[PDB]
């Protein structure tokens, strides 16, 4: 079984960083990319980038190039991504997906989700 | 059948005698405060897997004794007898 | 065009060689009464079945695999459950690398098999744990193909029983290994004694992005035998 | 405290004849003496060290030579001017020599071989000399007669005594000397097997414990 | 393991009966011989009875002979016990021990006690 | 004067005679391709070695015990393995009953071997249920053994293949027992062919009080074959 269990919620002062995670179990974590999403409250969705566990190569969305960092734990087998001079506007819920065997972006596992 | 055993209490031979021959067939018991029982001597001379080698008991036709070398904190607890030569089995009056 | 061995067949090749590492097939312990003489069992019909393995994935990025032979067996099937309750084997194996990509693939392996590969790591003076190397079925991953993770070049490491595997020409390769050990019967739970390494030299590439091309090895132990678990009196 | 393992192949059984069970030249003797008892007797007896005692008491009759090779290490108490020993070997029924300048060791009947420092150690071979067929290790029996006697003592089985001296007159400066031998025993032939033993010796002489 | 599991203790008025068990667990029941124990408070003991649970053949001491009655249960694996017309001298402890597999009376196995 | 079948051996017997049951062995299946096609595996140096039961009690009141023979040895060892994992058998078996007493000891029991014996609760309209014939090792206990639990006297039980152990003569009994069916292969869960059991016809006595008399049974199957696990494609 497929369970992608994020971590808690939690708020920041502005100025600050925060740091996330997307604990995968029930299946090989090397071989899927972890890609991650953003949704502002009561409005669409928005890609991020994604991080390739099994080389550490980011590819990442043009406006978020400067926000966040992503990248990823073998061992624990567990996705990070860190944001970096949080401001009024990044308050939402972060999610993350998982891609396919063959490099598809499709995505049916997700997250639950996580406020800031 | 009734079988006496010759001291009341103990402040480190206890013996006991028989109304008749008994054959061998005498065991010695020992009862916890707690309220647990485990023997200690079957068929007068042997010892029971698991007990300290200390104990020893003597061989008669009709007048066994128990030998116990040192003594100890735990040690103490009242030590009774058994014939089980012929029904009914009756027991002794115990010491300390 | 197939592999008909025992229980199992993997069918459907494409024409491939036999070609034996060194000169020599299992044989089956000629002659030793003068060692652990209770005499094997050698089970023949419940073991040779090409145990599959877990496909893996090869994208541009990556950068080889290995895998130690007596131990990427331990805990599958017939042959797992003989590693315990044994104490002594004797074994020769088969291996059976087969990727698959398209017409407008390019790229290169190199599937070599090292005897005795004693590793080592990097920038320390610490040998390696016990948990570095029992790795087991998923096997683990090279940190510096260049140096075979030792300090010997992968420029001489030709000199090993070895294939290639050229998606231009071919897309498969096959090694039989003899018994190589010094001893007559080994220990199956602390002793390794080949390990299958393959290596991409020339990395793929392609017009769109990341193309798995996943490979499939498959490895089958020969000419089996083990200690005596039935005896008289 | 790491348990391992390692098969083995073996086809030899050459290696425990007793032929070569007991030929392995072990230490019998150690002691010093200063030149200023100044002289080296010791009686050929064979149960002196208790390593080749245990080994050699497994049997009850055996019989070999002897190959007694003597190893001199001298010191000045700093060069030595070319000391020159002898070793004179006193069978039974010869008189043993009780000084240095005694006039036994003139006795030109028993052995004796005149070796220097510098030179390889000396070594001589010496035949079976029991009257019996075979040394008894074991003796159930007194020597001597009447009530006293002592114990297990065998008069057919004795040997001899060998005596080393410096040759040398009295030389201002007093050294030293350190004599060691090292018997092998050769051409063996064993009778009776008995069991070995286990708890330590406490005398030279019997069988206590 | 062998254990001798006894209820817990009870109390009756008197002309009343009661009954007991001695539940055994960790060897065969139907080899062994049952027997049942007496001690008053401050005395020492008194053989009652036995049971044999492979044919329910008892054998009873001669002053125990109208008190008390001796079962056996093979299903349940529990050796019962009942008395009959309490007075007040019938308060005391009761045991219960094992005898051996051949039909010796030599105990190795004792219950913990049950007062009355 | 030992009976070394496999891995296992009955020491030190009496002298003793292999009366077959009726007059046949084992077999081996002669020739049946029209029925399960897959040819039986026919396992025979991993089953056969005297998986001997717990030692029942024998006093004066016993009443007798019985066994059922594809039953008793479901849950015991290499032979119980095999009940699960196939749907199939094939077996006969060798049972050696043995009892030791004194000089001073009087006595006779009735070995006999039932095929198909078909069990009846006393005094009532309801058949047996599961737990009441699926005893396992344990066995059983006649309730009622002067008619068999089925009606049929015991008097004329001797019409089944029986031996008598007579502790003024002997104490051992030895029955070998074919493959006593209607199908050629049976199913062993739900199938019980044998029902070997033992009756105290005169009880025993002695001067004291209640001797044991302990028994032994050992049950060994003789030439066993299941169906096929492993097929080509």
């Known amino acids: 079984q497929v369970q992608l269990q994020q971590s808690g919620t939690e708020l920041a002062k502005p100025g600050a960083s925060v740091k996330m995670s997307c604990?995968?179990?029930?299946?090989?974590?090397?071989?899927?990319?972890?890609?991650?999403f953003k949704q502002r409250p009561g409005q669409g969705l928005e890609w991020?980038?994604?991080?390739?566990?099994?080389?550490?190569?980011?590819?990442?969305?043009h406006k978020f190039k400067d926000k966040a960092t992503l990248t990823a734990d073998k061992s624990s087998s567990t996705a990070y991504m860190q944001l970096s001079s949080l401001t009024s506007e990044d308050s939402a819920v972060?999610?993350?997906?998982?891609?396919?065997?063959?490099?598809?972006?499709?995505?049916?596992?997700?997250?639950?989700g996580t406020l800031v | 059948i009734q079988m006496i055993q010759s001291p009341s209490s103990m402040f480190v031979s206890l013996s006991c005698r028989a109304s008749?021959?008994?054959?061998?067939?005498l065991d010695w018991y020992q009862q916890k405060p707690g309220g647990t029982i485990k023997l200690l001597i079957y068929?007068?001379?042997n010892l029971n897997s698991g007990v300290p080698s200390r104990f020893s008991g003597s061989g008669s036709g009709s007048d066994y004794s128990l030998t116990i070398s040192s003594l100890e904190s735990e040690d103490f607890a009242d030590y009774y007898c058994?014939?089980?030569?012929?029904?009914?089995?009756?027991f002794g009056g115990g010491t300390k | 065009l197939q592999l008909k061995l025992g229980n199992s067949a993997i069918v459907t090749q494409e024409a491939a060689n036999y070609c034996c590492a060194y000169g020599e097939w299992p044989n089956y312990l000629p002659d030793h009464e003068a060692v652990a003489i209770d005499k094997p069992t050698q089970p023949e019909t419940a073991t040779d079945r090409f145990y599959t393995l877990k496909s893996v994935k090869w994208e541009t990025g990556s950068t080889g695999w290995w895998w130690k032979l007596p131990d990427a067996l331990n805990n599958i099937g017939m042959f797992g459950q003989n590693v315990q309750h044994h104490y002594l084997y004797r074994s020769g194996f088969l291996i059976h690398v087969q990727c698959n990509a398209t017409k407008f693939h390019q790229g290169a392996l190199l599937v070599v098999a090292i005897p005795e590969h004693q590793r080592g790591a990097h920038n320390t003076n610490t040998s390696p744990g016990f948990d570095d190397i029992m790795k087991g079925e998923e096997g683990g991953t090279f940190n510096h193909p260049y140096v075979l993770d030792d300090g010997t070049s992968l420029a001489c490491a030709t000199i090993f029983p070895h294939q290639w595997i050229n998606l231009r020409t071919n897309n498969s390769a096959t090694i039989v290994l003899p018994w190589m050990n010094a001893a007559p019967m080994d220990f199956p739970l602390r002793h390794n004694q080949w390990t299958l390494a393959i290596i991409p030299v020339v990395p793929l590439g392609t017009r769109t992005t990341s193309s798995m091309v996943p490979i499939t090895v498959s490895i089958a132990p020969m000419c089996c035998e083990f200690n005596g678990l039935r005896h008289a009196i | 405290a790491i348990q391992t393992r390692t098969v083995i192949n073996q086809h030899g059984v050459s290696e425990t004849l007793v032929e070569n069970f007991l030929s392995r030249a072990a230490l019998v003797s150690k002691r010093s003496f200063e030149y200023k008892k100044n002289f080296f007797k010791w009686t050929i007896n064979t149960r002196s060290f208790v390593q080749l005692r245990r080994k050699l008491e497994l049997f009850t009759y055996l019989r070999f030579d002897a190959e007694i090779t003597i190893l001199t290490t001298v010191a000045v108490n700093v060069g030595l001017p070319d000391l020159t020993l002898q070793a004179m070997f006193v069978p039974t029924g010869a008189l043993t020599p009780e000084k240095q300048d005694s006039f036994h060791w003139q006795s030109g009947s028993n052995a004796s071989v005149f070796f220097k420092i510098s030179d390889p150690p000396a070594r001589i071979t010496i035949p079976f000399m029991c009257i019996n067929s075979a040394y008894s290790v074991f003796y159930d029996g007194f020597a001597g007669f009447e009530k006293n006697g002592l114990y297990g003592i065998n008069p057919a089985d004795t040997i001899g005594n060998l005596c080393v001296r410096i040759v040398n007159e009295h030389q201002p400066v007093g050294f030293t000397v350190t004599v060691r031998v090292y018997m092998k025993p050769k051409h063996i032939k064993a009778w009776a097997p008995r069991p070995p033993r286990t708890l330590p010796y406490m005398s030279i002489a019997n069988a206590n414990y | 393991q062998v254990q001798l599991q006894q209820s817990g203790t009870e109390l009756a008025k008197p002309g009343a009966s009661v009954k007991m068990s001695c539940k055994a667990s960790?060897?065969?029941?139907?080899?062994?011989?049952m027997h049942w124990f007496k001690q008053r408070p401050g005395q020492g003991l008194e053989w009652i009875g036995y049971?044999?649970?492979?044919?329910?053949?008892?054998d009873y001491n001669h002053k125990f002979k109208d008190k008390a009655t001796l079962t056996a249960d093979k299903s349940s694996s529990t050796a019962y016990m009942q008395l009959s017309s309490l007075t007040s001298e019938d308060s005391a402890v009761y045991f219960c021990?094992?005898?051996?597999?051949?039909?010796?009376?030599?105990?190795?196995?004792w219950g913990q006690g049950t007062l009355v | 004067l030992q009976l070394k079948l496999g891995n296992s051996a009955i020491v030190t017997q009496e002298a003793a005679n292999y009366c077959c049951a009726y007059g046949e062995w084992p077999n081996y299946l002669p020739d049946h391709e029209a029925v399960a096609i897959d040819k039986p595996t026919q396992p025979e140096t991993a089953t056969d070695r005297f998986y001997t039961l717990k030692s029942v009690k024998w006093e004066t009141g016993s009443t007798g015990w019985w066994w059922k023979l594809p039953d008793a040895l479901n849950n015991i060892g290499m032979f119980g393995q095999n009940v699960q994992h196939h749907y199939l058998y094939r077996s006969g078996f060798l049972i050696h009953v043995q009892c030791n007493a004194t000089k001073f000891h009087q006595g006779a029991l009735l070995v006999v071997a039932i095929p198909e014996h078909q069990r009846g609760a006393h005094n009532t309209n309801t058949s047996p249920g599961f737990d009441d014939i699926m005893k396992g090792e344990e066995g059983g206990t006649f309730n009622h053994p002067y008619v068999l639990d089925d009606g049929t006297s015991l008097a004329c039980a001797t019409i089944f293949p029986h031996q008598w152990i007579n502790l003024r003569t002997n104490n051992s009994a030895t029955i070998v027992l074919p493959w006593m069916n209607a199908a050629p292969m049976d199913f062993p869960l739900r199938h019980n062919q044998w029902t070997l059991a033992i009756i105290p016809v005169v009880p025993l006595g002695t001067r004291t009080t209640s001797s044991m008399v302990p028994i032994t049974v050992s049950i060994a199957p003789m030439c066993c074959e299941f169906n096929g696990l492993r097929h080509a494609i």
């Open positions: 021990a094992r005898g051996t597999f051949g039909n010796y009376a030599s105990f190795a196995y």
């Open positions: 960790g060897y065969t029941f139907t080899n062994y011989w």
């Open positions: 049971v044999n649970p492979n044919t329910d053949y008892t």
């Open positions: 008749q021959d008994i054959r061998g067939n």
């Open positions: 068929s007068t001379s």
């Open positions: 058994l014939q089980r030569n012929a029904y009914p089995l009756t």
